[PDB]
Amino acid sequence: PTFFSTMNTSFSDIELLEDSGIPTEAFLASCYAVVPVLDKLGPTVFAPVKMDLVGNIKKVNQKYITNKAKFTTLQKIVLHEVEADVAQVRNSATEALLWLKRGLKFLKGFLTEVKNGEKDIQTALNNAYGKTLRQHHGWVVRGVFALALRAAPSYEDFVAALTVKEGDHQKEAFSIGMQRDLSLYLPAMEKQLAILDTLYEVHGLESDEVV
């Protein structure tokens, strides 16, 4: 096994509910799962990333826990905010999920480069950044990304952070397992992100604001 098939981690183990509903807890658990990897790779240097993710998961969860029966899916949360005219209120779940999906599109891009055989982690990150998050960042935040990029792990340190037992990365079985697991993880994520993108587009929730 690899990190990408560990319990609660994979987007591929999330089954959709009626009307393509994305279950709230399972989705948020998949988002959280990368946090310990960030901590293995750079507890200080990637702290902005960790804080962003944790904060957005918190903001979605804060609405969820208010009425779990009502808020069984992401769509139910967003659509309630829209009905209540609170999607634009500070700390909304709609805003938190906007930034979660943006961050996941970046993660998907980066892991696709890796899956397709990119061994330069900086190249992989920077290629994915340009296509995803860069458009949403201003000058100062682009500078923070550039700082993070300089501190990118070696390929070996990166894959070592994705093993279930130390040393696994030196086995061919692991490379095969990475391919197996990413070949499920990535299209499952894509499917969910497409659902979310449609939801945001249709309801006029894709904000043009940059940070």
Ligand SMILES: CCCCCCCC/C=C\CCCCCCCC(=O)N[C@@H](CO[C@@H]1O[C@H](CO)[C@H](O)[C@H](O)[C@H]1O)[C@H](O)/C=C/CCCCCCCCCCCCC
């Ligand atoms: C599988 C194991 C792989 C390990 C993970 C490595 C890749 C990490 C990839 C994705 C994780 C998610 C990235 C987080 C992107 C931050 C989202 C972002 O642009 N959030 C914005 C806006 O913030 C919003 O502000 C709003 C108000 O204006 C609200 O307050 C919202 O709540 C709030 O979110 C925030 O200003 C920026 C935060 C951090 C940007 C730092 C540069 C990112 C470095 C990239 C990762 C490096 C990879 C590590 C090495 C492999």
